[model samples]
Target: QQSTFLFHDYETFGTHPALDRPAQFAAIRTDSEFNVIGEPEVFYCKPADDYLPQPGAVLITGITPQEARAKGENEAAFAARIHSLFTVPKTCILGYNNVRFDDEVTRNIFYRNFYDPYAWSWQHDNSRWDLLDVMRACYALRPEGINWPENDDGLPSFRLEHLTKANGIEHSDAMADVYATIAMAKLVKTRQPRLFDYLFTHRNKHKLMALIDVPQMKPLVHVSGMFGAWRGNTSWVAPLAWHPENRNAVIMVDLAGDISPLLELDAVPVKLVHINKCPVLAQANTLRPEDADRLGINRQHCLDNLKILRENPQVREKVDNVDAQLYNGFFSDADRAAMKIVLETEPRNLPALDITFVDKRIEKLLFNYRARNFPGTLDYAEQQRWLEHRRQVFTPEFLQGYADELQMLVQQYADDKEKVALLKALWQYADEI
Candidate 1:
């Protein structure tokens, strides 16, 4: 039968270095008296591996400074016990925020003492240990928008003590530490025996849910640059090749930028579709004669299709006459041909389109359009009145507030000094809505 080792420590003793000394052994002994046996065999820092199952065991321990010292076992007999546990059952599970806390502390202690217990043993590789942190797992599963006290922010206080109290589990009147709280609950399984027999039976079910059902890391596909400086820039194409979704699909082209370095990251997975060294307009005009001839037939066919698209009541009504002309220019001969091929062959195919000409036209059109529709005339007196009204409505102080909030978020989450760099790059290569 497979067994799980539930290791518990003394009270909040693990938090304070001064309180976790040998003198703290008294608290460990006192808590051990209260632990539950049948729920899961509670072990101390010494030999947790002895309670391993046939295949292996899941070692659960709260990550704390004292637990780190115990795992390293600097003292004579304590070190031997730890060694014996690992030697007997080579496979073991480690718990705690191993990377952030437990592992760092243990690594420091081992190096300090010049003790390499499993120096040459591959089995002792830190990777071999199936370590899982309950705290991290819980955080990953926590729903967003749940409010908590601001002061208790950094250290999530849903440890055994807090959980037991929240769930109405019997605990000591004195404020027990994380480990002792778990031990006390375990003791109830032994002492009450029959009362928690059902809980013991469903123990594996809960453990499986905690370990397998809820994962620490989540699948995230981050895309940026929806607004601002990257507003109309097409430098976004280079980074789109890095997207895992497009890896096996289309070959990306660098129209105005060199995407060679990005494509080199995975040669087998990505292929270069095209390279445009000069402006997109110049590149389009200089297409190979043979390809240009083939594209000419398709281009004329696309013009015919545009008539039908223009005739559609939905299309006609959706865009006004001025917008219609803008759209027509936006989807010129080459654009239509590309779109037609994509629509007929593969709708999802993100064939690159040369939009440099369209972008310039659009910029000019926006300026002219906005100026014409400004609601006030270009007359000197009227313009002066409009400018004064704008200043009053859009105050410098109001604009400053917006900048301050943006700066605050950037400082908090933006690891890169350059703001929106990651986001703008993502937008360049994005295919459609």
Candidate 2:
């Protein structure tokens, strides 16, 4: 019964969610009507000793390891605090581009800290959304009272900084970005209330599934960054079939592309839209000429491709091997039960917890968790293992690459004195680690 929207963002050490670490996290809670609930919660997470921060990412975020250590909580504490905030029953956690980026970081953080990597999103009536695609949909379909931005090359840009600058909203750090996102969200709701509400209400799997998995499916307008900015990141797509492996995933053919190859070869390229990921979509009849002209989509060409596909369908039953690096699969029930014990046990007793896990990944994370979060609890043997783990992570070859990237960044940002200092700090950190 406690419904609210919690907008959040994270500044991380690097781009890879699995490898990199979150350095700063900021979140603001608001009611369904877009009214601010209270103060924003900002947390600086201290990096583990074994982890190395990327110099370029550091330069962009301006959150150095030294700064994080001086004024930050250890990762375990940070994870606990944020996890509680996210699972506040009926909360809709969201941020700009968070689904692909920040949310992944959160999953990794929770996995490492022995928390359920997926519960904060689905449990307690909680869900997630991304303003990036929401804004893209607004621009593509309803562009009445918003100032959109373009990159230096003049193509459309959905970047947070670009949008905030274009609309005269203050673009600053993490908390400021949250405020900017909420402001932009408020603007969308004000200018195009019906469209905004339509998207917000249907930002769930079953609701969207009903739209895509119909008895007589037809063309639907899809908006996503995967379409490339040249086409304003939108296209008319025809539902081919449900993915053979994942029930939540539906395969759609991009009607904007040529279908002659599909007719000839029977194996054509398709877009896999995950219904649970909040894919931006609208009715095909809603496509307008002015919007099509701006987004560079030819409505008639798409219609022609759709007609041919409907007549002679070349169905490929097998999907290519999906990327398994992240989202490998969910943990087993036994492993989850063991994980609860791991969290409940004290750090001192963790060494003798005597719990076997179904997933080797969780076992690895347990060692990492005890060592990084409570180093004092590790005995001599565990300490040596931790030392070896650090060596493996920061090998001589990895150090060389770190040095090379830092030197390149030093040259790239030589004119900026503050960034040079940041680069030097990273260099010093690399030496110590």
Candidate 3:
């Protein structure tokens, strides 16, 4: 079984602090099979403390801070609820470009709240995978039904809405994004089963290396280019320089660039091109196996090209002088480390880990604190109103300040009075809201 949450849009606070935290974020879920299993969850919240939503950031999100706040939960609870949902077993979180954006938003939320920012992945078997590379790979190898959307530069654009529309996937909100990603998964499996199988199972890196390693590069094998290429959704025939350290990784420099500029020159590896989900152009194009005749690509023709390319040591040497890298997975080195920590940690110890808490427990504690701090208080009706108020406006920052101190107090001071005194002190500040 799998459940997932997604995040997007970013901004800073202070210029206008009331609506500060993740102005617009949303989530959706699926079972282990990618079948939609739960109700879609969309959240829009302002931070409890001063937070700013980027006025310009909203343009990309198409969701304004005012809109996000009106729809948001207590910012703290919003993050907490997400933490709780994902920590369960058998959940696999995914996104369009989550490794770059969503994951950070989540991590920052945890950190700012004084929670162990790393615990979500560390404590849970909740694995994360990004669809960006997969989508690129699919476009390269299986453009069968997709109408590749073009950016202003006329290059293939990987934005979610563009992808969804081109592939006929319905999209508009958080749930749609989740559904679209799952749909993309199905397409990838159908179009590129070898790559799909490795990725879908969350298999290790070695398997991915073996899958992309064809005995020979076809004359026009289109691969999602290696990292640092101007475009990933293009075709090229490059020899593979398998990374020395990672058995599953390969590096192929841009054959398009002027290798003749110097037999040896100012080339730097820069960074990896596409690591995971790169496909040979033949595989990436709209042409299917049946259309191989038109594509002028044959099993034997490809074999011959590799034969000639390999025969020339000079050609191979220069491509090597430049650099490209490929791997079974698209998770950058940072993402790999993040995933490694998830795989390394013991799930049973999650709740007790530093800065981590049972999310539900923390949420309840927050509600009670806010209720107690209600002005002129002790009435059941007032508590009820506070509870309703919680539904309307809640800060993402409140839980940590109150709870972190409370947890710290109990840990340090054995006397119950000291804990209560600390709790009262925390409550005084909360009332100002």
Candidate 4:
């Protein structure tokens, strides 16, 4: 029910402009040298149906200009086939990395000819027939720290032959670079068409899956005992060990430093977040200096509006404009207990918690705790005692145990073939811990 267009380029002369234009096209069209003195006319001319869909998917890969001139037949054939595919409604899927290389090369060829058959039907708008990049898909799917020493992962090497040999699917049999290119084109066209189809059918699904399946630590688990330990200078070996096992979990942290190493393992750059710098705190109602003093608050340490402003200047200008006195209130003991139960049941649901509910609970608790005592007396002692009590209750041992329990749950429920290996790895990690 589906058709495919397999398009690939060839290696050609490095600097020969004559070989670059019409002459190269003529050579590909005729499968022979048209004229030695003048460039081929075929190169300058755009192929018919250059942009229209051939009623299936477009398989696009890139090659060098040198190969293009030397072995133009395969290129011409592939282009012809692509033209055929474009004759009908089709979907085009490629490596996300191809967005930069393969896509650019194709666009350049079309632009050079000053014709865009696909222009009327933009790739993004064609929901039924869209373009996909497998490289990008793979990058998103790949777990962190799984090093590929043999290949440079997903990079394109200048030497097409070597590159193809290294990463081309095993079925490719062409000894010539042209043959190799066609083989790759065919491989994508026929071998993994379902994957190509899935890319478009479930684009949002893939994005959500990436959030869970992309390798990283569970932020709540890592930050449970040490609220700000992610900011502290402690090696997070537990999370690192846990990352490979629970690659299919959402990772979040109060700040950036705790998750930086895990992010780096996945080639993502580090991003920092200071609690005082949070936008939510800026909008919080504030207590005056005298009010804070009367309440026995060390205005500096408290997460009050003025204190946050002092610590993070980026949002200072907007602080005063924010209404600070609204007290939505804190969580009841029942509410906290319910939250704890939910955390134990589905810690990954942290991202889905109602912000208003959480904020109300915290605000109520803090305001009530402060109202009970005045500034500089028994109030500070009570605050310290409560903080220490909460800290001691959620020890590393407790968090580790919860993680182990969840790992067990995952193992029991996991039925998908792809998820089994990951679940097993996580179970082993939990047992070891």
Top lDDT prediction, candidate number: 2
TM-score result, candidate 4: 0.27
Q: Please give the lDDT score at residue 133 for candidate 2.
A: 90
Question: Which 10 consecutive positions of candidate 2 have the poorest summed lDDT?
Answer: 317-326
Candidate 1 on 1-433: residue-level lDDT in tens? 2222323222221332221211111112112233333323222332111011110001111223333335433232332333333333322223322223333333322221222322312234212111122222112222122221112444334344454454455555222443444443454444445423422332232321222210111111111111111211111111122223432122322223332343333222122311111011111222233432422323333333333333332321221222223223234555344333422342122223233323333433322222323333245764564456445534668455534644564456467543344222212211110
**TM-score per model over all chains:** 0.26, 0.95, 0.52, 0.27
lDDT agreement with native, every candidate = 0.28, 0.83, 0.49, 0.30
Q: Which stretches of candidate 2 lie over 4 Å from their true place?
A: 213-215, 266-268, 314-326
RMSD (Cα, Å) for all candidates, in order, is 30.5, 2.6, 15.6, 31.8
What's the number of clashes in each of the models? 8, 0, 30, 47
Candidate 2, 1-433: lDDT as tens digits: 7689999999989898878888899998999887998688998998889888978789889999988877888888999999889989999999999889998898888877878888899898999998889898888888888898889998878888898898887776558889999988988888889989888877898877766733244888888889888887889888878877888888888988877666666236478998878898878866688889887899889888877766654454432111123376788898899999998887778887897887657756777788888888888999999998888877889988989998998898889999999999999888887
Checking candidate 1 for backbone clashes, the offending pairs are 35-186, 35-187, 36-186, 36-187, 224-423, 225-423, 236-428, 236-429
- The TM-score obtained by model 2 is 0.95
> Is candidate 2 or 3 superior in lDDT?
2
Q: Give the per-residue lDDT of model 4 (tens digit) for 1-433.
A: 2333222232222222211221122211111111122222232222111111110111111222223324444322433433433233433323212333333334333322212423422343321121222322221222122121232543322233443554543324122433343343344434445443444344332332332311333221111112221221111111111122233332222222333343333222122221111011111122234433432434333223223223443321221100122222333556555434432333234324453334343433332222221212334765675455445544778656746655665566567554454444434433442
As a whole number from 0 to 100, the lDDT of residue 185 in candidate 4 is: 35
Compared to the true structure, candidate 1 yields what TM-score? 0.26
Model 3 lDDT per residue over 20-93, tens place: 34655556666555556566666655544222333234433455444554566655566667776667665566
- Model 2 whole-model lDDT (C-alpha atoms): 0.83
Q: Give the candidates in order of lDDT, highest first.
A: 2, 3, 4, 1
